Amino acid sequence: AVLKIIQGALDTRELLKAYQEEACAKNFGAFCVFVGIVRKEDNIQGLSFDIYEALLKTWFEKWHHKAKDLGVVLKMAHSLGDVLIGQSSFLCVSMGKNRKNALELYENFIEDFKHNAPIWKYDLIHNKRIYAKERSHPLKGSGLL
Amino acid sequence: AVLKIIQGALDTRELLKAYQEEACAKNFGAFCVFVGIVRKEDNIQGLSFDIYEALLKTWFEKWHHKAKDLGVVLKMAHSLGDVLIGQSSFLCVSMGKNRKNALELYENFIEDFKHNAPIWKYDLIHNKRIYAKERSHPLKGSGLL
Amino acid sequence: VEVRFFGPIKEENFFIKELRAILQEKEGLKEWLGVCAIALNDHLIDPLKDGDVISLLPPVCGG
Amino acid sequence: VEVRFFGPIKEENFFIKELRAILQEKEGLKEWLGVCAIALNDHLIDPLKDGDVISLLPPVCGG
């Protein structure tokens, strides 16, 4: 599938293998991967995510199709719920025949994703979720009301 | 090691696993990978590479240390000799605490690499190497004599 | 209309310019209306009809 | 001095401004001197001494 929403930590080994096999089956020459890994900050146990799935799907589908028009396959996976320290919460791949478009979409996608994907992050501390307000990004049209 | 020169095709599975383990052991949160895969063009059997190893080492060591100053681990591996269609010939990783510097070095490195790494590429056709003149990039100070 | 609250917002979804004023009087929302974007039927806006669902989206941080 | 030829260049390395003129008279090199960069002792240049190694580097294409 183009967008994968996974409960808990991503199986990056399995995802990376599948993506590469696709790269080879499509005779691709360039393969760009990003993996977001939960790191230990202070003494958190990990992170937790909420996802607006319907909007995430449509938002991402526009990026997937913009990529396809340029000969690039763009796919992603993201965790839902708890992800512990050392585990992966987000992964994306941009691959194609040539490195130039693949690398450009990769950069552009990741930046857009950070600021616009409808996903909410919480620090896991003491088995409690603390919303990460200071680090968060207002969506377009914030403060409408 | 920081730079790996491998005879033949890269074992990307093994390299990616090792790099990720390092990412986790260093408590990194961002992991960027590029893999250059030999694709079938026309009816070539694959590609072959010559490497100026001493100069490649020093050239790359400057990039590794520029990366380190920014909190980013930058490593690479590249094939020497024959690499068949479907096999990987080049791999690099840029990883660190934060995505911003890791992604910037990744972009900048790959572009510099394409134009400046002392490596020569040949198409493998009929068991013969054909130099890829049209696609190649003159080094700084070309035509000195 | 239905009103749904995503992410950190505590309020439970319910079924009650005249949408603004009513949400502006719920105190569990004073923290939020200044920074929330709005989706009408899963589409961000910046008209109304029966069964319309309106979603409040606080600042995001995927990755 | 030693002269080494990297990549596509056919010539075998040997041990023979006065380096330019001599390479400029070898015909296996007419194809190459216009586009080759030069490293003196593994360092690109754009002086000489005994045991100096001079390397010719044709256009590159790693990846």
Swiss-Prot record, chains A, B:
Q: Which Enzyme Commission number(s) are listed?
A: 2.8.1.12
What's its top-level EC category? transferase
Catalysed reactions, semicolon-separated: 2 [molybdopterin-synthase sulfur-carrier protein]-C-terminal-Gly-aminoethanethioate + cyclic pyranopterin phosphate + H2O = molybdopterin + 2 [molybdopterin-synthase sulfur-carrier protein]-C-terminal Gly-Gly + 2 H(+)
Which residues of the sequence carry a binding annotation for substrate?
Answer: 37-39, 98-99, 114, 121-123
Any one Gene Ontology cellular component term annotated for this protein: cytosol
* Keyword Zinc on entry: no
Q: Gene3D superfamilies this protein is in?
A: Molybdopterin biosynthesis MoaE subunit (3.90.1170.40)
Example of a GO biological process term:
Mo-molybdopterin cofactor biosynthetic process
Per the record, the pathway is: Cofactor biosynthesis; molybdopterin biosynthesis
Pfam families the record matches? MoaE
Keywords, in A-Z order: Molybdenum cofactor biosynthesis, Transferase
Indicate yes or no for the key word Lyase.
no
- Could you state a single Gene Ontology molecular function term? molybdopterin synthase activity
| UniProt-listed InterPro entries | MoaE_sf, Mopterin_biosynth_MoaE
Biological role = Converts molybdopterin precursor Z into molybdopterin. This requires the incorporation of two sulfur atoms into precursor Z to generate a dithiolene group. The sulfur is provided by MoaD.
What protein family is recorded?
Belongs to the MoaE family.
This protein is called what?
A: Molybdopterin synthase catalytic subunit
